[PDB]
Structure formats: structure tokens, C-alpha cells
């Protein structure tokens, strides 16, 4: 996260760290959506251009964390993966269209002050909140700058951007399964997700029922926090039918 701040304790209790077993390192962010299901970006697991293809046994899920590097004894919980599900139409070849994956845990995780699932949006909440100018919140342990790494979880609030402005900021083909967020050069404020934040949640707090909803997944961006560029996010509601199909079936 670039130009953000230290998270408060328990601020994002759905935040998940995807952790590589060997070598031991941060792979990506992710989010807790039930006691057995974790949501992330497909490209965290599969991206052939960079020779990336992780299997279940390569990874661990670390939940309830705050410190990036510490083993947070009596606070975090570490879970093994039973199965990975990548969207069947995930487009790693062109533009990361449908950049979404689910992970089922081997055992349910116990909820605590530090561990709690986020809501997934219904059509109405999505329609209400996914509007240009409305702000969401992105969290992660990724890079603090494009070109080091934070001591603890970082947080930044960013406004959703008008689709034509998103489209005009890039040569990459944008789809309805993406949205973009971030400040314009003229707005003064800044901030962005970065490398290592991928797979983490873009959340919004509904003013109707005061619950947090995950509207986006950190997906891609040209550099980090560049003037005139924006962060792109997987549009969670647009892919919720696939999400429900996987959880229903498996």
C-alpha cells in the first residue's frame, strides 16, 4: 500500500495473508468470507507469463494478522488449503479479466476479536455503493512504494473512479468485471495498492446496515500511485454467481 497508514488493531479482521511455505514469504492478500472459504485474485495463484502456478501444498493461509513478518502467537491462526478454485474464464493471457479465485480451508477457522468474515454484496448494495466518488478501503502488506515493506498491515481509503476515466488512463482493455479507484492528479490526495497487496479486499461500509462489504479484489495497476494511473479491482458482485456456484457445489 502506497501513501496509506498503519491499520488499527482488529480494523480488518477478514484480512488474510497468503504465505509461501518455501521460501517463507508473502505471496498475496486475500479475505475471509466464511469459516472455511477464502477469496483472492486468480493471478496470485496462476500467471504463466511470470512462471507462476501454485498448488494447494505450496501455500498457507494466515488469518488475524497485523504484523507483516512476526509470528503472532495466540492471535493469528494458520490454515492449510484443501482446494483451490480458479474462475474458468480467468483471462491471464490479455488483461486479467475475471481475476478471482476461491480457496477452501482444510478445517474451519475459529472466529475471534481478530478474525471475522466480510460480507459479499447483493445486487442492491452493489448498485447503491459502486458509484464514482464513493470511497472504499484497501488493506495489505504489499510494497510501500513502486520501486520498502511495512512493519504492519497498511490501510488506504480511495474513491471509485468514473469508467471513462479508468478507460482513458490505460491502453489495457477494461471490462465490466473490473472497476478502478484512486485520486486524480488534481485532487491532491493520493494512495494506491501495490505489488504484494494483490488478492486483498476493497471494502465499503454500507450506510444502510452498517456492515462491511467486499466490493473489489486488488487486481492490477501500471506501477503504483502514479499520477494519472488508477488501481484496478475485480468486480466481486459481477462474479458472485460463480462464487455461489463453487460454494454450493463444493
Amino acid at each position: 500500500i502506497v501513501e496509506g497508514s498503519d491499520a488499527e488493531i482488529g480494523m480488518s479482521p477478514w484480512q488474510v495473508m497468503l504465505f509461501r511455505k518455501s521460501p517463507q514469504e508473502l505471496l498475496c492478500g486475500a479475505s475471509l468470507i466464511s469459516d472455511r472459504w477464502v477469496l483472492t485474485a486468480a493471478h496470485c495463484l496462476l500467471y504463466p507469463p511470470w512462471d507462476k502456478n501454485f498448488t494447494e501444498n505450496d501455500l498457507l493461509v494466515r488469518i488475524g494478522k497485523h504484523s507483516r513478518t512476526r509470528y503472532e502467537r495466540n492471535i493469528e491462526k494458520i490454515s492449510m488449503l484443501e482446494k483451490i478454485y480458479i474462475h474458468p474464464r480467468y483471462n491471464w493471457r490479455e488483461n486479467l479479466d475475471r481475476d478471482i479465485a476461491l480457496m477452501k480451508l482444510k478445517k474451519p477457522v475459529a472466529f475471534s476479536d481478530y478474525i471475522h468474515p466480510v460480507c459479499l454484496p447483493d445486487r442492491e448494495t452493489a448498485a447503491s455503493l459502486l458509484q464514482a466518488g464513493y470511497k472504499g478501503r484497501v488493506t495489505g502488506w504489499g510494497n510501500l512504494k513502486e520501486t520498502g515493506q511495512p512493519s504492519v498491515l497498511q490501510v488506504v481509503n480511495l474513491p471509485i473512479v468514473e469508467r471513462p476515466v479508468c478507460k482513458d488512463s490505460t491502453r489495457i482493455r477494461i471490462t465490466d468485471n473490473m472497476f478502478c479507484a484512486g485520486y486524480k492528479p488534481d485532487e491532491g490526495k493520493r494512495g494506491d495498492a501495490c505489488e504484494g497487496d494483490s488478492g486483498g479486499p476493497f471494502v465499503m461500509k454500507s450506510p444502510f446496515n452498517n456492515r462491511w462489504y467486499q466490493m473489489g479484489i486488488v487486481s492490477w495497476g501500471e506501477g503504483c500511485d502514479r499520477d494519472g494511473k488508477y488501481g484496478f479491482y475485480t468486480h466481486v458482485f459481477r462474479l458472485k454467481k460463480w462464487i455461489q456456484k463453487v460454494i454450493d457445489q463444493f
Binding site: 508473502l26 498457507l60 513478518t69 512476526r70
Partner: peptide
């Protein structure tokens, strides 16, 4: 600079 995690999770 990651602290080692309990061995049980790597088994």
C-alpha cells in the same frame, strides 16, 4: 525477515 512459524503448520 519473516519469523519462523511452528513446525506443525509445515508438516
Amino acid at each position: 525477515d519473516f519469523e519462523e512459524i511452528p513446525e506443525e503448520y509445515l508438516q
